[PDB]
């Protein structure tokens, strides 16, 4: 059968002791699911796994599949589940500097004091917009980091500094 989608919410980059949801998705109606952790004998028989706190031991490669009648699906793409905050942060610099003219070149530089051989560079994504903001029938899609701004309706393009972040965590079905 065709592959389902395996997704980590809010992120596949989970800090130690912070929650995350692994959601498998095949065609709707579908009932029978298997989450597999590669290079281990660990697995779950559910579309959705809430991890209430991340651990070194839960980091790794996961795939999932589904069953219709006598036939299993092709496995999903590998989800790489990463535990972050295991080690002291590196330092990140721009050479020649953080301000560069259009058409120019720049090299970003990651350095640790400690004996570490691998590095990954991420660019922050664009925030997405949604008093009181009710959410009815929440999903793991709604898990994430929220900030709010305040402003006058009379000067509607002059906004506050953003609120301290608020982590919204959608646990599993009760």
């Amino acid at each position, epitope marked *: 059968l065709p592959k389902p989608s395996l997704q980590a919410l809010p992120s596949s980059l989970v800090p130690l*002791e*912070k929650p995350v949801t692994l959601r498998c998705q095949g065609p709707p109606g579908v009932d029978l699911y298997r*989450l597999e*952790k590669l290079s*281990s*004998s*660990r*697995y*779950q*028989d*559910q579309a959705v*796994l*809430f*991890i*209430p*706190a991340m*651990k070194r*031991s*839960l980091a790794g490669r996961y795939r999932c599949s589904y069953q219709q009648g006598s036939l299993w699906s092709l496995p999903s793409d590998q989800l790489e589940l990463v535990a972050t905050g295991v080690f002291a942060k590196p330092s990140l610099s721009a050479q020649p500097g953080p301000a560069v003219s259009s058409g120019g070149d720049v090299t970003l530089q990651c350095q640790t004091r400690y004996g570490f051989d691998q590095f990954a560079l991420y660019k922050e994504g664009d925030p997405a917009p949604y008093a009181s903001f009710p959410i009815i029938t929440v999903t793991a899609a709604h898990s994430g980091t929220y900030r709010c701004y305040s402003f006058s309706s009379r000067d509607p393009y002059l906004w506050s500094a953003p609120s301290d972040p608020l982590e919204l965590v959608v646990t599993g079905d009760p």
Partner: nanobody
Framework: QVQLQESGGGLVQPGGSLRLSCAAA????????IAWFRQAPGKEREGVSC????????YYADSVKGRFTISKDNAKNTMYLQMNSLKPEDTAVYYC???????????????????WGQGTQVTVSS
């Protein structure tokens, strides 16, 4: 971040009986693998009993088969180790472990468990 809240442990006579427990908070054991491990003085951490999968098959180390019982109460969100007929060699720190993942491993091994009790001392003495 999650809670394994520990109860029981202590000094007991050879042939005596103790119940250890770990009470979850931040999660439930309903769809979790559960295990007890132990570390005697001058030994390695050994698996004592687990329920690895939903089939509710229980493994027991050879040395505790017929004396120890692992169980779960999804009403109290508590896991148990009932220890009967205790022997000097049962003296150890005991650790409840749980995973949101099931395992097909037939023996209980550290790699399969993510959430750990701080430790519960059991001492057996005549």
């Amino acid at each position: 971040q999650v809670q394994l809240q520990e109860s029981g442990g202590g000094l007991v006579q050879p042939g005596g009986s103790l119940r250890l427990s770990c009470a979850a908070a931040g999660f439930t054991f309903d769809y979790y693998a559960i295990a007890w491990f132990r570390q005697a003085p001058g030994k390695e951490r050994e698996g004592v009993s687990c329920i690895s999968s939903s089939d509710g098959t229980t493994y027991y180390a050879d040395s505790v088969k017929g004396r120890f019982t692992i169980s779960k109460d999804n009403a109290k969100n508590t896991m148990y180790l009932q220890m009967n007929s205790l022997k000097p060699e049962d003296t150890a720190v005991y650790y409840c472990a749980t995973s949101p993942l099931y395992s097909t491993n037939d023996r209980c091994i550290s790699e399969d468990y993510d959430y750990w009790g701080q430790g519960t001392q059991v001492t057996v003495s005549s």
